[PDB]
Scaffold this active site. Structure first.
Site, PDB file in Angstrom:
ATOM      1  N   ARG A 129       0.804  -1.209   0.000  1.00  0.00           N
ATOM      2  CA  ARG A 129       0.000   0.000   0.000  1.00  0.00           C
ATOM      3  C   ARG A 129       0.839   1.262   0.000  1.00  0.00           C
ATOM      4  O   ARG A 129       0.525   2.204  -0.728  1.00  0.00           O
ATOM      5  CB  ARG A 129      -0.920  -0.008   1.215  1.00  0.00           C
ATOM      6  CG  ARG A 129      -1.728  -1.277   1.281  1.00  0.00           C
ATOM      7  CD  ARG A 129      -2.679  -1.294   2.444  1.00  0.00           C
ATOM      8  NE  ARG A 129      -3.289  -2.607   2.598  1.00  0.00           N
ATOM      9  CZ  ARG A 129      -4.241  -2.889   3.477  1.00  0.00           C
ATOM     10  NH1 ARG A 129      -4.729  -1.938   4.262  1.00  0.00           N
ATOM     11  NH2 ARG A 129      -4.730  -4.116   3.549  1.00  0.00           N
TER      12      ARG A 129
HETATM   13  N1  LIG Z   1      -9.487   1.864  -6.564  1.00  0.00           N
HETATM   14  C1  LIG Z   1      -8.616   0.902  -6.222  1.00  0.00           C
HETATM   15  N2  LIG Z   1      -7.784   0.364  -7.124  1.00  0.00           N
HETATM   16  C2  LIG Z   1      -6.913  -0.592  -6.787  1.00  0.00           C
HETATM   17  N3  LIG Z   1      -6.812  -1.097  -5.552  1.00  0.00           N
HETATM   18  C3  LIG Z   1      -7.583  -0.630  -4.561  1.00  0.00           C
HETATM   19  C4  LIG Z   1      -8.564   0.409  -4.849  1.00  0.00           C
HETATM   20  N4  LIG Z   1      -9.205   0.681  -3.716  1.00  0.00           N
HETATM   21  C5  LIG Z   1      -8.676  -0.135  -2.779  1.00  0.00           C
HETATM   22  N5  LIG Z   1      -7.713  -0.916  -3.287  1.00  0.00           N
HETATM   23  C6  LIG Z   1      -6.941  -1.918  -2.547  1.00  0.00           C
HETATM   24  O1  LIG Z   1      -7.497  -1.941  -1.244  1.00  0.00           O
HETATM   25  C7  LIG Z   1      -6.494  -1.811  -0.251  1.00  0.00           C
HETATM   26  C8  LIG Z   1      -6.959  -0.808   0.793  1.00  0.00           C
HETATM   27  O2  LIG Z   1      -7.918  -1.441   1.631  1.00  0.00           O
HETATM   28  P1  LIG Z   1      -8.284  -0.762   3.028  1.00  0.00           P
HETATM   29  O3  LIG Z   1      -9.776  -0.639   3.115  1.00  0.00           O
HETATM   30  O4  LIG Z   1      -7.412   0.454   3.150  1.00  0.00           O
HETATM   31  O5  LIG Z   1      -7.771  -1.850   4.090  1.00  0.00           O
HETATM   32  P2  LIG Z   1      -8.426  -2.025   5.543  1.00  0.00           P
HETATM   33  O6  LIG Z   1      -9.343  -3.191   5.349  1.00  0.00           O
HETATM   34  O7  LIG Z   1      -7.239  -2.285   6.422  1.00  0.00           O
HETATM   35  O8  LIG Z   1      -9.131  -0.747   5.883  1.00  0.00           O
HETATM   36  C9  LIG Z   1      -5.225  -1.391  -0.957  1.00  0.00           C
HETATM   37  O9  LIG Z   1      -4.202  -2.341  -0.685  1.00  0.00           O
HETATM   38  C10 LIG Z   1      -5.517  -1.450  -2.429  1.00  0.00           C
HETATM   39  O10 LIG Z   1      -4.691  -2.429  -3.045  1.00  0.00           O
END
Ligand SMILES: Nc1ncnc2c1ncn2[C@@H]1O[C@H](COP(=O)(O)OP(=O)(O)O)[C@@H](O)[C@H]1O
Ligand SMILES: Nc1ncnc2c1ncn2[C@@H]1O[C@H](COP(=O)(O)OP(=O)(O)OP(=O)(O)O)[C@@H](O)[C@H]1O
Lengths: 506, 71, 50, 187, 354, 472
Positions: free
Chosen positions: A372
């Site tokens: 990330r």
């Molecule tokens: N628009 C997007 N395009 C590509 N990957 C995404 C997108 N939105 C989220 N992701 C993926 O989702 C992850 C973020 O999830 P997040 O909700 O931040 O995790 P958590 O469940 O810990 O809150 C990132 O690693 C990313 O790879």
């Protein structure tokens, strides 16, 4: 000879000096020892999580206090702590020796070294339960942790202060990634700049004695033990040691973090730490939750992994970077434990068993492994010559199940299929040979721009060492350019294209 | 065997005196423990099950468990 | 160097079984009697000091 | 605000008793009457002890109480009433324990800070006396309050001595010192 | 001399509560005796309830115990006779032979809850144990002082395989065998004894090359949770004293995990996930980490696995498989082609095929 | 008249205070204890009787001694309010950790207040155009309602919230109160830098947001109350100023899990799967104070973390009834690259009626859910045999369905570094016409991959032209 007896007699003077001031405002009898935990009457001035010492050498942590008695968890087998003995209180919240003198040593969870190389030259004591640094002395990550693997720094880069997860299955090549990263840090640990050195603290929990013995032998073959710290909590020893040992190792990491230096830590593997924690919470009648890990087992890995980030310039620009390892069950990513480590760490390197079954080691599943805040801290060169590579492996993964039909296709899918197979065979790597970024750039560069397409598929493994020795013998100045600059300008790019097409032509 | 529920220090004290307040507590009672929308309450010997009560501040309650000691 | 460290370990384990021999030497003595005086004067030193 | 907490393990009956009698002064009498009823239990051992069984009754416990107070009119005042509660509460079995605990609270009010001088063999009187003096001539006891002291014989220790009181102890004995010598020389 | 005599206050199935008089209490995991008209009845103290009162698990049948019987103490843990005189003698978990060949005139008596070897003594390069069977030493070589998972049900020549290991370790490395049936079916216990006589690995007149420890199924679960430790201590005395490379055979480690489940469910500890005891990792480690290689010698273990309901995410094989260095499958489809042994080549994989 | 007590029991994050003054401090009042690290705040949960309270600990209780003096503060945990708190990072107690001095504000309201009355409730059919495709087509978010993002472990809950920040909170005009409940400290720092650079936080000037954080590092007393702190700052601006209030909360599940880490210790019997028994009431008090009265609007966006994608978990299943527009995120969609991985099936809203969004919009949404439901029904026969064993209407249906799935993707303005594509803010009407066009069959011969990771249908035509000029 008698020189350790001299030192031990000086320590006898300390013990005899301590006996002249020993008045233990604390002692209480052991009412009952049961379920591998002790109840103690007395100790009317003890603290929560204060270290105590029974009369047989087994230390203990007093984790709960009640009106009437105090409940102290053990730190070993309960074979030693007998009913009705004597409980002095030490006086401390649970601390471990931290400082630079541990480099080379192999300690267990309480700073007792078990290598057989004398006492720990300890630069201080520090708590195990340290509050994590708040949101203000943090900086987002901007420096690379060059793991030396090809596919890791190609696809899923690691920043100093970026908590990355190595998740996988049993005997599927999980430990080898962390071990190759520790052996790759030899590039800078021999060097002179502190801010490029990267100290490795490997924290073996729940593993066999002989595995940690072979791993110390491996880190002394390739000379990593001038910067290694092994914290061993092997599965012979009892459960609150395993509950404690990664936390004390995180205190070891925070010592390097506050003092400006940079340090990598490897937890291996926290799916046995949660085993030890569900043992300690199913012997104190605390009721289980989903899949019988107790309800706060999210909080445990939280308060562990949150003591690792990148400090900003206000605190001294130190860092601590963590690689926990999670043993799943048969390619699962949705049990209750691996959906708590994922919801903390900044990404996954999902070492799928099926690819290692085809021998492609390390077996990073590319379409699942993502990071990330990796992309903002990769080496600039790889980010210039692998901005297609993630999208290209996504493209090749799209046509993975479409080509199993055996149907004749167009030209574009055959071109991408050949280049994708060359890249899949390209990212293999033998054990104990991490490739520095100065050599990771040209191999990936030969992979991206179609130069491999005339080669048969079996020659690629020796193409790697052949093209590397071709660049080491002749175009050494290009490797020094990639080393110094860390970036490919247009002239560097054209010279690299010439140096490829030369060796590609034969 | 196990600590019972009519053995708190503020309740046995009065019984030691010989005042015997429990016989006097038919219409009135006292709050023993009150958390999570539940009020173990000592007294009200004449109380029923599923009977409405009012606490002295102004919030109302239903009496469900009639144990020997408390309500 | 490896053999030097091994010889130091052998010296230490010989003096460990010699420590066992010293335990056997100490435990037959009327230091079992004479040492109660040592605790007596030591408790005099400790408890008077506060 | 009572002294020396019982807290939890059935000393609360005593705690109530103490605080109920603390506001009405008469504690020594209470304490003495507890001594007298404990002794008259002990000096009638068949069914003075063996009639402290849970399988009797409500009524028979009450009549043992009446049989117990029949031997002496006006048994203090408060400790004759407390038995009834316990008879009704059937916690009579855990009773002399309450006697010992009220004794602890009482001699805490006196301030007898009971100590101990553990050994593996009993010792002369001169050592006893000199240690008792020292312990009396100490910070520990703030004076205005006494200081018992008991030597006990412990084989589990290899000799020496250890002083104990106020959950505060000093051990200069042999066993622990052998231990420490070993630990430092076992590396 | 100075006995520690107390009274049995409570008999609950296989759990026995023993009261001791004051300032006398032995710690956890110490052997206690009760004299019966039938023999002796051994207890192992596992929990201290306070009140000078301990709580033990049985090691033999607990019928007929009047509460109030004298409880004699032996201070140390469960003693076992060790050494040369133990060979060819079927010892139960108590330490007494049951083959009716008289008492065993052994020289020492060892505890079984010993320490595992310290980290400085663990051998830092696992070499290959030359077993002697070809397919073993070619494909999935057994780690010298490592752990080996021998799968497969009976009737595929598993006892033939294990006697072949006995003879070949007797020849090549000269090491002795300690077989241990935890939870062993009694009938096939006797059939294994008769077959080990007739194959020559047990000589009732000469020098036999194996020590049998048969913890039978009709013993209470505290027995089966220590039978493997008995076999382990008989291995450790041959390792660290006479300096050999000793083969410790354990059948069947899943029944040892059942023994752990039922001991730590009789003690009133809360059960874990699937229903195995919450001390699973630690009470597997106290059996695994005492089977290793020091600088003196080594004990290599061949231990079977009953995979429960043909499933490998169940925590008992999923805990044993965090310890096994090399697997060896005796399949059906290989002995069906009349092949002796039936070491299937594609499945038996080692971590030391490197 | 200070009210002094003694610590008589410590078990982790639960501490017992015995009093001797007969005036016991009431429920939900704040005690405090002078520590060698400073001070530490407790909250009274239940009276055990015997003049003894049993309290939850708002910070870590390593190193208390039995008998340490316990001091009273009379009321609940007070929080600074008002315009002074803008651009500030307020902790659970109310000590700021942006180290820019204390918060010189007027009032400090207590957190624990009752929800508004039933007569004070207000309704609104104000449709919020957000610019995301999958929201504004299939489940339109409601102003004044509440918005749920049920999402598994790492399928874009936090990224989607930052997407809604970057697409709403600038063009909102009211205020915003972000509340980091149990999320990552580092993600809190990155949102702080994004608020500084994009001018939402103006440090020396005037800002529009109020950061109320407190993360997964904190012991569970803080996580069971930090959402109440963000709530009090939200409903202050709802009641004191009469504005529109954006209340972003991430993550609401950590609240209930802090409800599950103290309740086994407070002597409550363990309920179902491992959570507390006081769940519907505590989730009720946290949800029903986030509402919309006649004084102002609160349009809150709340993430919901789901443990291992088991939507029969009691906490998100309880949460479903409180939300006016759910949005389900599933990992099995996100592995195929469809970002965002909005489940087009299980998304709902109180909106999306024909009389609310228009008849054309409603008909387009119904046709899209029909086609995707047809795909999810035919999933198994596709998995076994292949696409060749369908009919000839249903094979066209499956092909148009797999067009529409890859068309549901949208390159986010915040996830720009993962995909390498700049952001796409597609308005509502173009999305309505775009889905109407693909449903009517105007584009059935376009290859499927050209629908993927696109803006509107104009960019579908343009990207199909790009791949036409490349493949040739
Ligand atoms: N628009 C997007 N395009 C590509 N990957 C995404 C997108 N939105 C989220 N992701 C993926 O989702 C992850 C973020 O999830 P997040 O909700 O931040 O995790 P958590 O469940 O810990 O809150 C990132 O690693 C990313 O790879
Ligand atoms: N690059 C490589 N070259 C050669 N062997 C490899 C490589 N990567 C992995 N292996 C093999 O993988 C096996 C196990 O390695 P590793 O310990 O990483 O797996 P693991 O799942 O971590 O095991 P454990 O979980 O028990 O530590 C080793 O036997 C090693 O031979």
């Amino acid at each position: 000879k008698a020189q350790p007896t001299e030192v031990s007699s000086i320590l006898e003077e300390r013990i005899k000096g301590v006996s002249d001031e020993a008045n233990l405002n604390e002692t209480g009898r052991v009412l009952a020892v049961g379920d591998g935990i002790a109840r103690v009457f007395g100790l009317n001035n003890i603290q929560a999580e204060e270290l105590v010492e029974f009369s047989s050498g087994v230390k203990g942590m007093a984790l709960n206090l009640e009106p009437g008695q105090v409940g102290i968890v053990l730190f070993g087998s309960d074979r030693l702590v007998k009913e009705g003995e004597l409980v002095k209180r030490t006086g401390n919240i649970v601390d471990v020796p931290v400082g630079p003198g541990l480099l080379g040593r192999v300690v267990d969870a309480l700073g007792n070294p078990i290598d057989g190389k004398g006492p720990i030259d300890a630069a201080g004591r520090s708590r195990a339960q340290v509050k994590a640094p708040g949101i203000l002395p943090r900086r987002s990550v901007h420096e690379p942790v060059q793991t030396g693997l090809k596919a890791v720094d190609a696809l899923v880069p690691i920043g100093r202060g970026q908590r990355e997860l190595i998740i996988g299955d049993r005997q599927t090549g999980k430990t080898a990634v962390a071990l190759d990263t520790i052996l790759n840090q030899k590039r800078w640990n021999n060097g002179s700049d502190e801010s490029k050195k990267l100290y490795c603290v490997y924290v073996a929990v729940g593993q066999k004695r002989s595995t940690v013995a072979q791993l110390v032998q491996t880190l002394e073959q390739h000379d990593a033990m001038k910067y290694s710290i092994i914290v061993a909590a092997t599965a012979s020893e009892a459960a609150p040691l395993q509950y404690l040992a990664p936390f004390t190792a995180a205190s070891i990491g925070e010592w390097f973090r506050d003092n400006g230096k940079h340090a990598l830590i490897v937890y291996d593997d926290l799916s046995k730490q949660a085993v030890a924690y569900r043992q300690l919470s199913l012997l104190l009648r605390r009721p289980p939750g989903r899949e019988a890990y107790p309800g706060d087992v999210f909080y445990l890995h939280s308060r562990l992994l949150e003591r690792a980030a990148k400090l900003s310039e206000k605190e001294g620009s130190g860092s601590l970077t963590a690689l926990p390892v999670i043993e799943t069950q048969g390619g699962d990513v949705s049990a209750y434990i691996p959906t708590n480590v994922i919801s903390i760490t900044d990404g996954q390197i999902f070492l799928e068993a099926e690819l290692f079954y085809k021998g492609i080691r390390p077996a990073i599943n590319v379409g699942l492994s993502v990071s990330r805040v990796g992309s903002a801290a990769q080496v600039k060169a790889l980010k210039q010559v692998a901005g297609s590579l993630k999208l290209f492996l996504a493209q090749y993964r799209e046509v993975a199940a479409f080509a199993q039909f055996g149907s004749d296709l167009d030209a574009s899918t055959k071109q991408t299929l050949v280049r994708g197979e060359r890249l899949t065979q390209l990212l293999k790597q033998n054990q104990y040979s991490p490739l520095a970024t100065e050599e990771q750039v040209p191999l990936i560069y030969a992979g991206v721009n179609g130069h491999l397409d005339g080669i048969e598929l079996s020659r690629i493994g020796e193409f790697e060492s052949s093209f590397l020795s071709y660049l080491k013998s002749n175009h050494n100045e290009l490797l020094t350019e990639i080393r110094e600059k860390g970036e490919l300008s247009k002239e560097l790019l054209a010279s690299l294209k010439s140096a490829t097409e030369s060796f590609v032509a034969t | 065997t196990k600590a019972q529920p009519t053995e708190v220090s503020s309740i046995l004290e009065e019984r030691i005196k010989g005042v015997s307040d429990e016989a006097n507590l038919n219409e009135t009672g006292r709050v023993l423990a009150v958390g999570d929308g539940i009020a173990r309450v000592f007294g009200l010997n004449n109380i029923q099950a599923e009977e409405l009560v009012e606490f002295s501040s102004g919030v109302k309650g239903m009496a469900l468990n009639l144990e020997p000691g408390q309500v | 160097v490896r053999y030097e460290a091994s010889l130091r370990q052998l010296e230490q384990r010989q003096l460990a079984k010699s420590v066992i021999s010293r335990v056997q030497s100490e435990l037959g003595n009327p230091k079992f009697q004479e040492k109660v005086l040592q605790q007596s004067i030591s408790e005099i030193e400790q408890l008077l000091s506060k | 605000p009572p002294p020396v907490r019982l807290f939890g393990v059935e000393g609360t009956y005593a705690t109530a008793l103490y605080q109920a009698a603390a506001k009405n002064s008469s504690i020594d009498a209470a304490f003495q009457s507890l001594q007298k009823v404990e002794s008259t239990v002990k000096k009638n051992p068949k069914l003075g002890h063996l009639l402290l069984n849970p399988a009797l009754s409500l009524k028979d416990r009450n009549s043992v109480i009446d049989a117990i107070v029949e031997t002496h009119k006006n048994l203090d005042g408060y400790v004759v009433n407390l038995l009834k509660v316990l008879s009704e509460n059937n916690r009579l079995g855990c009773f002399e324990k309450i006697a010992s605990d009220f004794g602890v609270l009482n001699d805490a009010h006196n301030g007898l800070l009971k100590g101990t001088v553990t050994s593996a063999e009993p010792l002369d009187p001169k050592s006893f006396k000199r240690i008792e003096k020292a312990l009396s001539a100490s910070k520990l006891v703030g004076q205005g309050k006494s200081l018992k002291l008991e030597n006990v014989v412990k084989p589990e220790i290899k000799g020496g001595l250890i002083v104990e009181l106020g959950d505060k102890t000093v051990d200069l004995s042999i066993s622990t010192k052998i231990q420490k010598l070993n630990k430092v020389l076992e590396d | 001399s100075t006995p520690i005599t107390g009274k049995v206050t409570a008999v609950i199935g296989a759990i026995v509560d023993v009261h001791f008089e004051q300032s006398e209490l032995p710690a956890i995991l110490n052997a206690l005796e009760i004299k019966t008209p039938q023999g002796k009845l051994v207890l192992e103290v596992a929990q201290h309830l306070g009140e000078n009162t301990v709580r033990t698990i049985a090691m033999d049948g607990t019928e007929g115990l009047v509460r109030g019987e004298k409880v004699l103490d032996t201070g140390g843990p469960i003693s076992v006779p060790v050494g040369r005189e133990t060979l060819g003698r079927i010892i139960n978990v108590i330490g007494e032979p049951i083959d009716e060949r008289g008492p065993i005139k052994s020289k020492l008596r060892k505890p079984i809850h010993a320490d595992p070897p310290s980290f400085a003594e663990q051998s830092t390069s696992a070499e290959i144990l030359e077993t002697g069977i070809k397919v073993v030493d070619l494909l999935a070589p057994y780690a010298r002082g490592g752990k080996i998972g021998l799968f497969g049900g009976a009737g595929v020549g598993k006892t033939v395989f294990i006697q072949e290991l006995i003879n070949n370790i007797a020849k090549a490395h000269g090491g002795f065998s300690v077989f241990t049936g935890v939870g062993e079916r009694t009938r096939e216990g006797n059939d294994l004894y008769r077959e080990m006589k007739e194959t020559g690995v047990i000589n009732l007149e000469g020098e036999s090359k194996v020590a049998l420890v048969f913890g039978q199924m009709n013993e209470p679960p505290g027995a089966r949770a220590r039978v493997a430790l008995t076999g382990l201590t008989i291995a450790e005395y041959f390792r660290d004293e006479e300096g050999q490379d000793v083969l410790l055979f354990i059948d069947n480690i899943f029944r040892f995990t059942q023994a752990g489940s039922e001991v730590s469910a009789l003690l009133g500890r809360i059960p874990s996930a699937v229903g195995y005891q919450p001390t699973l990792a630690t009470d597997m480690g106290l059996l695994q980490e005492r089977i290793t290689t020091t600088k003196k010698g080594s004990v290599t273990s061949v231990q079977a696995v009953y995979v429960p309901a043909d499933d490998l995410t169940d925590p008992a094989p999923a805990t044993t498989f965090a310890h096994l260095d090399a697997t060896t499958v005796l399949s059906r489809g290989i002995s069906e082609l009349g092949i002796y042994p039936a070491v299937d080549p594609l499945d038996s994989k080692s971590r030391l095929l490197d | 008249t200070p009210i002094t007590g003694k610590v008589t029991a410590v078990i982790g994050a639960i501490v017992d205070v015995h009093f001797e003054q007969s005036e016991l401090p009431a429920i939900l009042n704040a005690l405090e204890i002078k520590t060698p690290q400073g001070k530490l705040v407790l909250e009274v949960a239940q009276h055990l009787g015997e003049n003894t309270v049993r309290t939850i600990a708002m910070d870590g209780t390593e190193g208390l001694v039995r008998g340490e003096k316990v001091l009273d503060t009379g009321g609940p945990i007070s929080v600074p309010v008002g315009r002074e708190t803008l651009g500030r990072i307020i902790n659970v107690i109310g000590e700021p950790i942006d180290e820019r001095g204390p918060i010189k504000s007027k009032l400090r309201k207590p957190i624990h207040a009752d929800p508004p009355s039933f007569a004070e409730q207000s309704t609104s059919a104000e449709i919020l155009e957000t610019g995301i495709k999958v929201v504004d087509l299939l489940a339109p978010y409601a102003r004044g309602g509440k918005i749920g993002l049920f999402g598994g472990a790492g399928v874009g809950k936090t990224v989607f919230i930052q997407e809604l920040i970057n697409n709403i909170a600038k063009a909102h005009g009211g205020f915003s109160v972000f509340t980091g409940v149990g999320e990552r400290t580092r993600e809190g720092n990155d949102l702080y830098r994004e608020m500084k650079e994009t001018g939402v936080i103006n440090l020396e000037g005037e800002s529009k947001v109020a950061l109320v954080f407190g993360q997964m590092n904190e012991p569970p007393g803080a996580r069971a109350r930090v959402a109440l702190t963000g709530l009090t700052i939200a409903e202050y601006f709802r009641d004191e100023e009469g504005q529109d209030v954006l209340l972003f909360i991430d993550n609401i599940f950590r609240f209930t899990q802090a409800g599950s880490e103290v309740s086994a210790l407070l002597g409550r019997i363990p309920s179902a799967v491992g959570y507390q028994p006081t769940l519907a009431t505590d989730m009720g008090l946290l949800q029903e104070r986030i509402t919309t009265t006649k004084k102002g609007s609160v349009t809150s966006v709340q993430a919901v973390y789901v443990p291992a994608d088991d939507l029969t978990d009691p906490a998100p299943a309880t949460t479903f009834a409180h939300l006016d527009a759910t949005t389900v995120l599933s990992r099995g969609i996100s592995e195929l690259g469809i970002y965002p991985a909005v489940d087009p099936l299980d998304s709902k809203s109180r909106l999306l009626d024909a009389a609310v969004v228009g008849q054309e919009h409603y008909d387009v949404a119904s046709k899209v859910q029909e086609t995707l439901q047809t795909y999810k029904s035919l999933q198994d026969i596709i998995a076994i045999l292949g696409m060749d064993e369908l009919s000839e209407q249903d094979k066209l249906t499956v092909e148009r369905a797999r067009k529409i799935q890859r068309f549901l993707s949208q390159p986010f303005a915040v996830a720009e570094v993962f995909t390498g594509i700049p952001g796409k803010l597609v308005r509502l009407k173009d999305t309505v016409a775009s889905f109407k066009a693909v449903l009517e069959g105007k584009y059935d011969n376009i290859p499927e991959h050209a629908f993927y990771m696109v803006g509107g249908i104009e960019d579908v035509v343009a990207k199909a032209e790009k791949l036409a000029a490349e493949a040739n």
